[PDB]
Design a protein around this nucleic acid. Structure first.
Lengths: 175, 168, 106, 181, 123
RNA sequence: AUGUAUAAAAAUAGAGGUAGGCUACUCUCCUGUAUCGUAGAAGAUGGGCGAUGGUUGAUGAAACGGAAGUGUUUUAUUGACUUGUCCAUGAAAUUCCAUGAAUCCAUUGCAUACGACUUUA
RNA sequence: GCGAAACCACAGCCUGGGGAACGGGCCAGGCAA
RNA sequence: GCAGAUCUUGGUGGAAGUAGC
RNA sequence: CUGCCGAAGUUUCCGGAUAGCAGAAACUCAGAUCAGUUUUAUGUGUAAAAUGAGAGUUUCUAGUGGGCCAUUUUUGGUAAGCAGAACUGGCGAUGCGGGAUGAACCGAACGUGAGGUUAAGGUGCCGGAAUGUACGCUCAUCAGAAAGGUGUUAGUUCAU
RNA sequence: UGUUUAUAGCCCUUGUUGUAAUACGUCCACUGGGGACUGAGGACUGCGGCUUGCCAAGGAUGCUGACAUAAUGGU
């Protein structure tokens, strides 16, 4: 295919600028800047329409175009309604104490299966955790959830027997 | 510099065979001498007629009847591989039948490392109907929405003072 | 000091040679502005010269010049083959040769 | 055109292609100075060139670029030894050369040589984790010089605008415009 | 972008026996070839490779597979001439072509005018 | 040596400028064959005219320039020059190419294959 | 202070490959002060 | 008519101011 | 010291006598015979057209009277390679250009020189010569100069 | 979308000027320039052309200079 195009509808965000291959998507929730210099994909902006055009791109380039479109759609959704993920703590004998600091930017986990060493995890920028974490970046929420799960991990313990830990219960849109 | 040469030949008449049949075929050769030698090898493969048993009667080159009008050409070729037995059929869009032929030879010589001796041109035909076209790339070259930037621009006067604009 | 320079600057590249055998009778010269064999036809026949100085004061001056003549082009990049009255020293590789404009055919 | 001193900007240039043109020029009795060698580019992604260096010890790309040329010139021959000193490779743009023109080599430009979508490596980024520990200071000088140069360009642009207006206002300009000047 | 391969786009030949002459693409042959023709009778209808061509901002509307007579009729109808020349890009090319044809005497006149031009230096 | 002449950054798959209030503009690119400079017995003698400006030399320093600032201007005045537009003479038979501290030293053990080292002197 | 003999084509950085050893000379190399 | 013959004779070096006495 | 000619390097019988090669002389012929020749045709041999070259004797006398490699041919093989006979050339008596270098590979076989053009091989640099043109393919994270692959590239065929 | 020259036309088929022109291939006892390296021979013949004479036809001769009282040279 010499020319391939992908069309998307811009949301009601204030700014949909994609100048210098940087997507400065500013919506009612906030303004988020994203870099797409990794893949050389032509972009056409016309009103509320954003078109991703690949000129004789390879299969890997074609695959990245769909990935870029999903990334753009996810960024638009986050800038419009946001992303919220809820996780439920699981304990068997020793409850795990969770402390929030800096408006939820820092999470401290104590007494995790009796552990006396507190684990401190720093939340990603633009994401606030109160456990329900809400933010305008779905990727930031997902990475923070993975870090929290990694912190609350049992080492040299029976997974089938010891079910204590932290797992994400659900994840959706704030609005 | 390939050119399509028509070759007509027949076996040497004798008391056993007073009137030989006329065998004519169109093959692409860079010169008359190559065409005649290829024709003999083809006849030996098919009719088993030796060079001494026969003789060529007429050689003539064929120009493109409409060299200024774009066309699509489909060629059937049998190619010799490690097994020594392969068949392929390809389509190309070009303004000259020779241009299509030399284009396929380059593609065969690149994808399969094909030699001139190994390749034998089986069938040549002109593709005209839209539904006749099968290959995807030429299908993309068929729709009226053909528009794209020029690829491979890259445009001794060494040590150019300014940075090249490389744009429009 | 704008003026003078009725000649064209040129650089003395090397000798006419194989991969390992060198014949120093003729030398390769790359004239400025010459970048094709067809262009070098204009410079065929000109008088090239090598100009160098030395400590000894001969005839009251300090300049020794080894004249020459362009003979044929050398390749597609405008190089030329020049024969001198004395074969150039092997040390003068990558120096300056002054291609004056005579004998002019224009 | 060739000059006694030539300044070549190494940003957006292939190492091997840049090495070739300078190797011929150096044998031609010409002095060549290379600036911003840290911004040279090599075809092939970052990990491959990292593995290449791991198999291979000078951490300076100026030395690395010099080393590449050194094996690309007749080093044993005394002519090659002499031509080596005529080449000056320095990182960034030093003050002795910042106020001078910086030409580029078309045969080494990445945009003219590299297919779109092809991975490439930067020497300065590559050298950052192999022993070089001066990226910040080298970078810090770069913005400082370019900011001063940009201010100089604005003054030159304003001067160019004023003389261009004066040139157009001059009736002499269109008197003999038939010559294309 | 501003330049795209479309039927009717005017192009300038940069390498070949017709360097410096303009042409209009009529049909697309392949990803590397195209058939073009020019209003000038000296340029015959020939297929050129995309490497030896450059794309210009000006684009003209012509039917697919148009004949040479109709293209010339179309070119005159849309006044393609003096339209590309109106652009400063053609003006630079015209000046460079004239400058390469300047004789020795005209060079002295250029020197005299240039010296008088620098005599203003008033702001 | 022979004009020993030239400074943006940055995209290049868009940049720059231009202009309006980062948002809407526009224009140029598609190189340097560009631009600046290049006119005179190496550039004479004067007469001017015309700029009455320009080109610079000479010195008197001001700032900038850390890096390798050692150079960029700003000039202050003076000295000339000015082919900017012009004149009148002049320039040649070479009458075809060749052009004061420190070391040893003494002290010194803080040393010690031997020097070194080590303070003092 | 008095004073040999032996030995001696000529030398002496290696790295590899150099098909027949090749390293002690050849080519690629680095070194080479 | 010499470049060789662990060639004959004479001379002379490095080794070496070394082994050393 | 220079100049010319210059092998054989081994059949065959049997340390040899032969031969052969090279010469040296004497002869008779070019209207005469020939050929590491090719055809024609009769039955691969034989006999009789072209292409070339003058061809044939007798005598007497130096040296050799090994191989290596390669091609091929076979037979067996024999773990497997391989071995064993042959077959025909080349080196050996032979330098030069190329193959990074290298006795066997690709070119070409040598008086001293000037110009011209090439062979093999090459034109990014070392390195003499296009960072030639057209077209594709190669992404290697060991490139490049049996198979497997959530490895691609082009795809083909068959299903819907 | 479907449509048939329209308010673009194209393509094909003839028709079509014609002996179009270009290109390719080949020839010219057609011609006009650029550059390099050679001067062997030493009366006369010969063979040709022009018209006895003359010539590019059986091999280079002219015009000049400078240096020499150093250049060119050799070790």
């Amino acid at each position: 295919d010499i020319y391939k195009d992908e069309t998307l509808t811009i949301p009601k965000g204030v700014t949909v600028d994609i100048k210098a291959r940087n997507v400065t998507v500013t919506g009612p929730r906030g303004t988020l800047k994203q870099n797409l210099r990794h893949v050389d994909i032509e972009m056409k902006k016309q009103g509320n329409t954003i078109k991703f055009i690949v000129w004789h791109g390879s299969r890997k380039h074609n695959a990245c175009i769909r990935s870029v479109y999903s990334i753009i759609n996810n960024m638009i959704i986050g800038v419009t309604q946001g992303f919220r993920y809820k996780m439920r703590l699981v304990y068997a004998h020793f409850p795990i104490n969770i402390n929030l600091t800096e408006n939820g930017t820092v999470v401290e986990i104590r007494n995790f299966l009796g552990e006396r060493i507190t684990r401190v995890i720093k939340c990603l920028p633009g994401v606030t955790v109160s456990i329900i974490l809400e933010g305008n970046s779905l990727e930031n929420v997902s990475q923070s959830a993975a870090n929290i799960k990694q912190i609350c991990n049992v080492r040299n313990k029976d997974i089938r027997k010891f079910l204590d830990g932290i797992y994400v219960s659900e994840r959706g849109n704030i609005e | 510099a390939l050119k399509e040469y028509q070759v007509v030949g027949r076996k040497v008449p004798t008391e056993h065979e007073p009137v030989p049949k006329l065998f004519r075929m169109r093959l692409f050769a860079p010169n008359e001498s190559v065409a005649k030698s290829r024709y003999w090898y083809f006849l030996k493969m098919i009719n088993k007629v030796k060079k001494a048993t026969g003789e060529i009667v007429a050689i003539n080159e064929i120009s493109e009847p409409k060299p200024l009008k774009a066309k699509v050409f489909g060629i059937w070729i049998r190619y010799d591989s490690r097994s020594g037995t392969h068949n392929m059929y390809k389509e190309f869009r070009d303004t000259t039948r020779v241009g299509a032929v030399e284009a396929m030879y380059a593609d065969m010589a690149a994808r399969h490392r094909a030699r001139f001796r190994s390749i034998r041109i089986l069938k040549v035909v002109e593709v005209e109907k839209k539904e006749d076209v099968r290959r995807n790339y030429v299908k993309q070259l068929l729709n009226p929405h053909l528009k794209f930037p020029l690829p491979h621009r890259r445009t001794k006067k060494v040590f150019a003072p300014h940075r090249p604009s490389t744009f429009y | 000091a704008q003026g003078h320079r009725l000649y064209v600057k040129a650089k003395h590249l090397s000798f006419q040679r194989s991969k390992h055998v060198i014949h120093p009778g003729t030398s390769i010269v790359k004239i400025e502005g010459c970048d094709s064999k067809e262009e070098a036809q204009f410079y065929l026949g000109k008088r090239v010269c090598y100009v160098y100085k030395s400590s000894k004061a001969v005839r009251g001056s300090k300049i020794r010049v080894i004249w020459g003549t362009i003979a044929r082009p050398h390749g597609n990049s405008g190089a030329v083959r020049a024969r001198f009255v004395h074969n150039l020293p092997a040390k003068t590789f990558g120096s300056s040769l002054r291609v004056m404009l005579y004998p002019s055919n224009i | 055109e060739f000059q006694k001193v030539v300044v070549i900007d190494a940003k957006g240039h292939l190492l091997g292609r840049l090495a070739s043109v300078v190797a011929k020029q150096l044998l031609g009795g010409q002095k060549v100075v290379v600036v911003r060698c840290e911004e040279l580019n090599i075809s092939g992604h970052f990990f491959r060139n990292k593995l290449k260096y791991l198999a291979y010890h000078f951490r300076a790309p100026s030395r690395i670029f010099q080393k590449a040329v050194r094996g690309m010139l007749p080093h044993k021959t005394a002519r090659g030894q002499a031509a080596l000193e005529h080449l000056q490779a320095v990182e960034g743009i030093p003050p002795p050369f910042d106020k001078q023109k910086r030409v580029v080599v078309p045969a080494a430009l990445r945009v003219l040589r590299l297919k779109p979508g092809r991975k490439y490596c930067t020497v300065g980024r590559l050298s950052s984790e192999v022993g070089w520990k001066y990226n910040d200071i080298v970078a810090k000088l770069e913005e400082r010089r370019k900011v001063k140069s940009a201010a100089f360009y604005q003054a030159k642009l304003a001067k160019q605008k004023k003389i261009a207006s004066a040139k157009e206002a001059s009736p002499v300009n269109q008197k003999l415009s038939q010559f294309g000047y | 972008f501003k330049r795209y391969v479309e039927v009717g786009r005017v192009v300038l030949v940069t390498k070949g026996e017709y360097t410096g002459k303009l042409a209009v693409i009529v049909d697309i042959v392949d990803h590397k070839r195209a058939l073009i023709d020019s209003p000038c009778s000296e340029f015959p209808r020939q297929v050129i490779r995309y490497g030896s061509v450059v794309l210009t901002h000006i684009v003209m509307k012509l039917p697919r597979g148009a004949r040479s007579g109709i293209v010339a009729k179309k070119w005159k109808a849309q006044d393609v001439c003096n339209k590309w020349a109106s652009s400063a890009w053609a003006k630079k090319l015209e000046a460079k072509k004239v400058r390469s044809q300047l004789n020795d005497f005209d060079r002295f006149a250029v020197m005299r005018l240039k010296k008088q031009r620098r005599e203003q230096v008033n702001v």
